[PDB]
Design a protein around this ligand. Structure first.
Ligand SMILES: [Cu+2]
Ligand SMILES: [Cu+2]
Ligand SMILES: [Cu+2]
Ligand SMILES: [Cu+2]
Lengths: 491, 491
């Protein structure tokens, strides 16, 4: 019987309840206190039952990334109501044209509890190094910045391929807000303490909702167990571990398959509209993208044990003229629990490609540069972008063009039974054999037969069948000249 | 309405029909001829629809190894009846004490069509280099040689862990019969032509049958799709390809899930007794093994693109005194289609170990020597034996002790939900951390967290839970000092 009203439709009278509730919680050091709730995600680490090895309970990159967050956000909200609340956590639609940071934060003075919070555990206040994060261009379709990504998440079908777009989209915000500060909102291991953090995740949660049932309207209900669900059949840590917020709902309903439905944790949003668009209205904008063929840059991101950014630079035919193809962010931090996107990260680079006039399957590759919160780091681990072209009219097929030679990436799962696959003949040195489904992981360690062309993967081709595939080098030796062994998988 | 009567209970009158039927087939060069039927398995290769790359349709090592064979044997039999037969293909129980090779073969003179056959395609007659393959010791339990293996196949539960024991057992015979001859019955790429071959596989088929329903008597019905079945949902090549024996039954019922039941291809055996033991009687002998703890030497055999033998030598405490721990055979041949046992190969070495007095989990390893049809070959690719101890009373649990350092093998699947696992602390240089379930294949490529001991795998321990596991080196560097990354799996 609670509701997360918009932070914009907020009223002075309403504003009070929020500040009072949060303050009372902030000055609370009990297991249900604010210094303890923010401790779940960032530092200090806990989860493992006395493993004396710490461990960030923050679940990022995993298939349940949104599941652990959706429950944590309600944990924050529930803790408030218990401390004297009236309305739910205010959400902020940061997709729309941002003219300035919410006055709910900016009001640093008057000791606003929503702008920052004193860690208390190891001192240090929650500081933020705001970034531009603005520059209008055009709304209502083709909205530059944020919105596109968010709208590109609802666009995606299936949940496992959606989760990626869901996270990456939310990864952006964290950066601009926390900037490059020590214990900022961008620093995974501390971003949890920030007042915004607790409420920001709610803003993202709302997007999940709109998409959740949005799928139902496409005879493609995706929510609980769909694809990589073996990871879901396990309670969210440390919500289940005996030392949680002790909130009957959380401590027990910590199971991912239970947190899948929001109408269970007693709370609803004032609306289900994004960027001023209603579900039916917004569903139209989505139809716009699908009406225009766009080339995407596949990414098989993997845990870099740290949060940072990455500027995608497209090579030009001139001589080397780079190009700001865009830029995304990867959350994380040393001591984080290992993760690796099983699914590809749909990233649009359409226009950028058309400028230098290159083909998706034809000789097309680029060299991007990544960067930590502030300093430069090993841009090495790309891992080799896996170009993917999504045809316009008549979609939900998507083509997948891996590569041939100098490719770098573990088994990529484009999933979405019915998807198309191919290979990049990049580098003429290597022809177009590329074994195919060698056999099982064992064989995948490169052990191709004596010229016995176990055909299946040729030049510019395609697929349609599902199941478990694979792609190894034409010959045994031509395998170790780049480690060609991308184990593609379906479903 | 046909029957495969024993080759021993055979009578002169009956013998004729068999010789006539086979002869008429042998001198038949049509698509349903004998030179064409034997062509399905060995050379010349076919299967792929005009891939001009040949391809041995012989399916060995795969989970459907017995499925493709069971259908081929009926193909041979059906071809005969169509050419004038009366009884089914005679089976020979080679498990029992062998006093001498069947007189159905030995009768070289009189131009016996069952002793050999002229390839005709590329000349050369079917020759065999018989091996001793005898030496009585004791029957009715603990029968040295053959029978043990066969009885060790019915012993095993589940079908995927059975198929291995099923093949390896049948792999033996091939050797002794073909010996070390060019186009012998031991040479995969030609063994198909041999008259025995066509009938021998029928002998093995009978064992599959007795085991098939034998399981049903243990409330554990395993036949069609059980474990690795994705490989079954595909017709057996080239039985389906348009150019098969054109036998309505084969050409159509080529689907593995259909060949699972024999009572479908119109044919039954004169009995279902092995080594003179009835199903109920034999089921007792099985109860004997389970009543005595036996240590086994796990094996994750993988396609060596050739058929050969391997002598397991156990190291002694003396100084290096080896020991004839036994010996098995691996069928195959250059140009063969890639295979790799997903499941482990149960091989008993009990007594051998007790002599030098060593412990399964404790410092225990051995160096075996493998050999091609006649010459020595790279004994390299072991791959590191994965010792497994099967406790007596109260079985169907099996313990799995992999290893720590200098281990070599892809993801091993002990399956059998409820199985136990551990690790060999062999080599004190490496302690007992061994990460555990790092994450997904991506993470498995070694990328363990910063000392963050994602506990699960410790010293002499165990398991019980199912699902997909894994085991990586304690530290990132300690991983590449042997490539510790055996991806264990259950179910
Ligand atoms: Cu987080
Ligand atoms: Cu977050
Ligand atoms: Cu065979
Ligand atoms: Cu065989």
């Amino acid at each position: 019987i609670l509701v997360r009203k918009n932070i914009h439709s907020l009223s002075h009278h309403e504003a009070e309840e929020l500040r009072d509730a949060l303050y009372k919680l902030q000055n609370d050091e009990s297991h249900g206190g604010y210094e303890h709730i923010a401790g779940f995600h960032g530092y200090p680490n806990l989860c493992p039952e006395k493993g004396d090895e710490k461990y960030p309970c923050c679940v990022h990159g995993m298939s349940i990334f949104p599941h652990w967050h959706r429950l944590h956000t309600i944990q924050f909200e529930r803790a408030l109501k218990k401390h004297g609340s009236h309305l739910g956590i205010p959400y902020w639609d940061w997709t729309q044209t941002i003219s300035s940071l919410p006055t709910f934060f900016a009001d640093s003075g008057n000791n606003n509890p929503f702008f920052k919070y004193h860690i208390r555990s190891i001192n240090q206040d929650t500081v933020r190094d705001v970034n531009e994060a603005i520059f209008q261009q055009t709304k209502f379709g083709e909205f530059s910045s944020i919105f596109y990504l968010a709208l590109q998440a609802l666009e995606e079908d299936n949940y496992c391929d959606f989760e990626v777009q869901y996270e990456i989209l939310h990864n952006e915000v964290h950066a601009l807000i926390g900037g490059a500060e020590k214990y900022s909102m961008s620093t995974l291991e501390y971003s949890a303490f920030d007042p915004y953090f607790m409420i920001h995740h709610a803003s993202l949660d709302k997007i999940w909702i709109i998409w959740q049932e949005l799928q139902k309207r496409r005879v493609k209900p995706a929510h609980a167990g769909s694809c990589a669900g073996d990871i879901m059949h396990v309670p969210l840590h440390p919500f289940n571990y005996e030392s949680v917020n002790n909130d009957d709902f959380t401590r027990e309903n910590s199971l991912p398959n239970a947190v899948v439905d929001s109408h269970r944790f007693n709370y609803k949003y004032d609306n289900l509209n994004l960027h001023g668009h209603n579900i039916e209205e917004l569903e139209e904008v989505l139809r716009s993208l699908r009406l225009k063929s766009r080339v995407f840059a596949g990414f098989v991101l993997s845990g870099i044990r740290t949060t940072a950014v990455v500027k995608v630079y497209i090579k030009s035919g001139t001589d080397s003229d780079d190009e700001y193809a865009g830029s995304f962010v990867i959350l994380g931090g040393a001591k984080e629990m290992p993760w690796a996107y099983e699914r590809l990260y749909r990233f649009d680079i359409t226009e950028t490609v058309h400028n230098l006039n290159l083909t998706d399957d034809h000789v097309k590759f680029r060299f991007d540069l990544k960067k930590y919160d502030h300093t430069e780091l090993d841009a090495s681990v790309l891992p080799a972008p896996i170009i993917v072209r999504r045809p316009n009219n008549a979609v939900f097929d998507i083509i997948e063009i891996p590569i041939g030679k100098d490719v770098n990436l573990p088994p990529k799962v484009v999933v979405k039974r019915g998807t198309k696959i191919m290979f990049m003949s990049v580098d003429e040195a290597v022809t177009t054999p590329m074994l195919n489904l060698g056999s099982y992981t064992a064989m995948f360690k490169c052990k191709v037969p004596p010229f016995s062309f176990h055909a299946f993967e040729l030049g510019k081709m395609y697929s349609v069948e599902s199941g478990d595939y694979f792609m190894t080098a034409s010959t045994t030796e031509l395998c170790n000249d780049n480690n060609l062994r991308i184990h593609v998988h379906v479903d």
